[PDB]
C-alpha cells in the first residue's frame with residue numbers, strides 16, 4: 383500500500399504542490415516543492431495532527447494480485463488532482479497576510495471556483511514532524527462575528543422584500559432604544575436623517591438595526607440561509623456551517639444587533655450571525671452574480687497517471703437568494719462604501735472596486751476587521767473576503783486595505 387505511488391496535487395497554473403517520490407526501499411516519500419504554500423488546502427494525513435485538506439478529502443483518487451505486495455507498484459498508481467487555485471493569486475494573498483493573523487479567499491463569482499485561499503499563521507509540512515493556532519484553517523473552520531459586513535444581507539433582504547430602497551431616509555442617531563436595549567453608532571456619531579445608501583456607506587448601526595427590525599426575525603434568518611447559512615459550503619472541501627438562531631427564539635433587541643452582524647442572543651439555538659470567511663465570500667459572489675449563489679469548489683479536475691482527464695468539476699448553484707434587480711441595488715450600495723464611505727482604503731486608482739467593511743469585538747477588548755468585495759464593478763470577475771484579527775493590536779480598517787490590494791494584484795494577474 384506504500385509501494386503504490388500517490389498522485390500529485392497541482393495548481394491550475396501548473397505548479398506542483400505535493401508529489402510522491404519512490405525510495406529504493408520500495409516505499410514512497412511525500413515531497414512538497416513549494417513547502418509553505420497553501421498549506422491548509424493541500425493538507426496532510428498525520429497520526430498526531432489528524433487529516434486535513436485535499437490530501438485527506440481526495441485520498442482515494444490520490445491513493446488475485448492484491449495478495450502479492452511485490453506486485454503493488456506495477457499495478458495501480460494514484461491519479462493527480464488539479465486545483466482551481468492559481469499560484470500567483472495565492473502568493474498575493476499569502477504576502478498580504480505576512481505579520482498578521484487572519485484569512486483571505488479569492489473566488490470567481492460566476493462559478494464559485496476558489497482561486498486563492500490563505501490562512502495565517504501557517505506552517506510548512508516540514509514542521510509537522512517537529513512540534514507545531516497555526517493548524518486552524520481560518521478560511522473555513524473558524525467562526526467569527528461578521529460585524530457590519532453582514533449588513534450586506536440585511537440590505538439585500540430589505541430591498542428584495544420591497545420594504546425599503548436605497549433612497550429611503552432613515553434616522554441615524556448616535557444612540558437609540560430598540561427592544562428595550564441600546565443600539566449605538568460607532569463613537570456614538572449622530573448622523574441625523576440620511577438615505578439608506580449613505581447609512582450603508584457610513585455603516586450606521588442605528589439605521590441598519592431599524593431595517594432589521596422592520597424585516598423581522600423570520601425574514602432575516604430566511605435570507606441568511608438563502609445565501610448559505612446552515613450549509614457546509616464546498617463541493618470538495620469542508621467548511622463549518624455559518625450559524626443563525628431559531629427565529630422563534632430571537633428577541634427584538636437581539637434582532638437589532640444581528641442585523642448589524644453582532645450575535646447577542648441567549649437561548650437554546652446558537653447566537654448569530656457567526657460566519658466563516660468562505661461564507662462571506664459566497665455572499666459577495668452572489669451579489670456580484672445577479673443573486674445566484676454558487677457552491678464553491680477547489681478541484682478543477684482529476685488526471686489519470688498518464689494525463690487523461692478522468693473527471694471535471696461542474697459549478698453548481700445553491701439557488702437564487704435575491705432577484706437580479708435586488709443584486710444590482712446592493713452592488714451599487716457596495717460601490718458607495720468604497721467610493722465615499724468606510725471602505726476608501728480599498729480604492730485602487732483606475733479600477734472600480736465595491737465592497738462592505740466590518741469590525742467586531744472579541745475578548746480582552748481585541749477586535750477583528752473584515753472586508754468583502756468584488757471587481758471590476760461593471761462586470762465582476764473576482765470576489766475577495768478577508769479577516770484581519772486584532773490580537774494585541776488595533777487593526778481598524780485593515781481588512782479593506784488588504785482587500786483592495788489583493789483585488790488589484792489579482793486583476794493584473796488575470797490580465798496576463
Ligand SMILES: *[C@@H](O)[C@@H](NC(=O)c1c(O)ccc2ccccc12)[C@@H]1N[C@@H](C(=O)O)C(C)(C)S1
Pocket residue numbers: 528529530531566567568569584585586587642643644724738739740741742743749778779
Ligand atoms: C460595524 O461593524 C460597525 N461597528 C461597530 O460599531 C463596532 C462593533 O459593533 C464592535 C467592535 C468595534 C470595534 C472597533 C470599531 C467599531 C466596532 C460600524 N462598522 C465598522 C466597519 O468596519 O464597517 C466601522 C468601524 C465603520 S463602525
